[PDB]
Ligand binder design. Structure first.
Ligand SMILES: [Zn+2]
Lengths: 94, 76, 345
DNA sequence: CACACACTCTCCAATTCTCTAA
DNA sequence: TTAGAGAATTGGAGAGTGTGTTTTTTTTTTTTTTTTT
């Protein structure tokens, strides 16, 4: 009957288990900065982790595109706001 | 002529960077890379340049994506 | 359009007779089971083709009739329609093939890696807090060897005796091999890699031509609505050696005032390069139509061209001591000369 | 004939624009 | 001033229409001109 609805980023995907919680678990281990490298290699070490994780969550879209989409969703969704403030409230509590 | 020369040295430096990104053998030579990733799983990318340069491999893996987000753009 | 009919055949019976034959049968009358021992050579990679002697299946049916259990006339099925039984015997073999007993050096092969990564990806996906076409993994070629005289596969035919009524049957053909192709790879299973989803998909080919896939259909590509691109990889494809030959009837067989007619023989797999031009040979094979495909199929009409799939080949035609057996008779020069063309006096 | 490619037509929903009240 | 509800425009799915495709090509006879027979 219909055309298939478009797959699109939303908190029900972006908040889900391999998702922001996967970043909070793995990134502090996998992303390493030093003045012993040039700035361009440090930037590449940051960007690798997020590029592979963005490919795992939403393989449809390029990395710059995924960033523009995350900006619009974090600006609009109240549940995503509630999750982010909840993370900061934990660090303030400690 | 000095002004032309300086500009040709800048275009030469750009083409040197393009040559450093280009195939050292022909278009059909066909070498194929698999990238292991966390969750112990594979992607695949073509071309001899991607085998040696991890950064080029990931750039090529993004370049091939067939989606684009629609852009938005703008009297006598 | 598509009616249906009651044929006196049941491939569920005959599949059970075939698997019951393969596991049971031993030619112990030559004094473990013959085809099991053969399949061990296949599983150890010491062997690359399985020859099924139709003359054995008689001894199977004879033993079963002597035990009073009516085996379902299997030779009269596989002479009468041999083509379909190449599929049934491969299914019956794969269901019964023993695990290897010699080391293979497994990781030297590509498909052992590809299919393992495909296995593990399915487990790590399906944790979630056929698998692929079996022809891809058949490392062996099946062939039938016909009845010796002891029945239509026994009687060798001249090329003109092969009427259209023989299509699908196992036949034996007598003639000269008049010309032979160089050996080329035919595809059987084409492996593609999706660029974006990193997932392997297989097309199986059963015609003179095929159409490539191009657009990904892996679960994880279509579920993510990602328009993945498929690229063909010859490294993971399965090919078979293909060689086309032409056979002509012998001068003795041609009736008075006619011209020597010919057939195309297709030889596939390990049986390749067993034929050479100017051989007089009996080729036994499965007689078939080669259906035109695409636009030519429409305009050619019902007039099917035809070929023979080779199955087995019969050519029509001590050293270090025998030179002493000459020398020790003596006068070798004059006797060797007198032995050049002895019919000329 | 029929089955792929080339190319146009049409509808539907997805995204962004614009206005209102919290 | 932020943020959320309602209005308009664009993308592309997918349905629909239309077109081209087999394909060969040496062989064998008959002739007319050059030259090597
Ligand atoms: Zn894919």
């Amino acid at each position: 009957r219909k055309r298939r609805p478009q797959v699109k980023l939303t908190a029900e995907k972006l908040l889900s288990d391999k998702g922001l919680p996967y970043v909070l678990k793995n990134a502090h281990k996998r992303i390493r900065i030093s003045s012993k490298k040039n700035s361009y290699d440090n930037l590449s070490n940051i960007i690798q982790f997020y590029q592979l994780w963005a490919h795992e969550l939403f393989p449809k879209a390029k990395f710059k595109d995924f960033m523009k989409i995350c900006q619009t969703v974090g600006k609009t969704d109240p549940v995503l706001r509630e999750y982010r403030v909840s993370l900061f409230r934990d660090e303030m509590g400690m | 002529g000095f002004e032309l020369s300086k500009l040709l040295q800048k275009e030469h430096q750009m083409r040197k960077n393009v040559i450093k990104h280009t195939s050292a053998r022909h278009s059909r030579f066909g070498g194929l890379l698999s990238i292991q990733t966390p969750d112990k799983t594979r992607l695949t990318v073509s071309g001899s340049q991607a085998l040696v340069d991890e950064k080029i491999a990931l750039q090529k893996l993004d370049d091939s994506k067939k989606w684009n987000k629609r852009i938005i753009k703008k009297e006598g | 359009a598509l009616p249906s009919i009651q044929l006196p055949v049941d491939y569920n019976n005959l599949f059970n007779e075939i698997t019951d034959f393969l596991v049971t049968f031993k030619q112990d009358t030559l004094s473990g089971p013959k085809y099991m021992a053969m399949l061990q050579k296949v599983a150890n990679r010491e062997l690359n083709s399985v020859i099924i002697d139709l003359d054995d299946i008689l001894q199977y049916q004879n033993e079963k009739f002597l035990q009073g259990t009516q085996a379902d006339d299997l030779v009269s099925a596989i002479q009468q329609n041999a083509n379909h039984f190449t599929e049934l015997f491969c299914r019956a073999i794969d269901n019964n093939m023993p695990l290897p007993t010699k080391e293979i050096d497994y990781k030297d092969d590509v498909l052992d890696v590809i299919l393992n990564q495909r296995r593990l990806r399915n487990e790590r996906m399906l944790s979630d807090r056929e698998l692929f076409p079996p022809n891809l993994t058949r490392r062996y070629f099946l062939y039938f060897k016909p009845l010796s005289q002891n029945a239509i596969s026994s009687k060798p035919l001249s090329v003109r005796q092969i009427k259209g009524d023989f299509l699908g049957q196992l036949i034996t053909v007598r003639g000269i091999i008049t010309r032979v192709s160089d050996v080329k790879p035919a595809v059987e299973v084409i492996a593609y890699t999706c660029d974006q989803c990193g997932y392997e998909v297989f097309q199986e080919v059963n015609s003179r031509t095929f159409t490539p896939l191009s657009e990904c259909t892996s679960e994880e590509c279509s579920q993510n609505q990602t328009k993945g691109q498929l690229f063909m990889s010859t490294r993971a494809s399965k090919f078979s050696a293909f060689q086309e030959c032409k056979i002509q009837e012998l001068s003795q067989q041609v009736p008075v005032g006619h011209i020597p007619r010919s057939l195309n023989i297709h030889v596939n797999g390990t049986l390749v390069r067993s034929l050479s031009p100017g051989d007089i040979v009996d080729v036994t094979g499965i007689f078939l139509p080669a259906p035109y495909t695409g636009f030519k199929a429409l305009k050619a009409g019902l007039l099917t061209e035809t070929y023979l799939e080779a199955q087995f080949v019969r050519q029509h035609k001590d050293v270090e001591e025998r030179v002493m057996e000459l020398i020790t008779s003596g006068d070798v020069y004059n006797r060797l000369a007198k032995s050049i063309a002895p019919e000329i006096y």
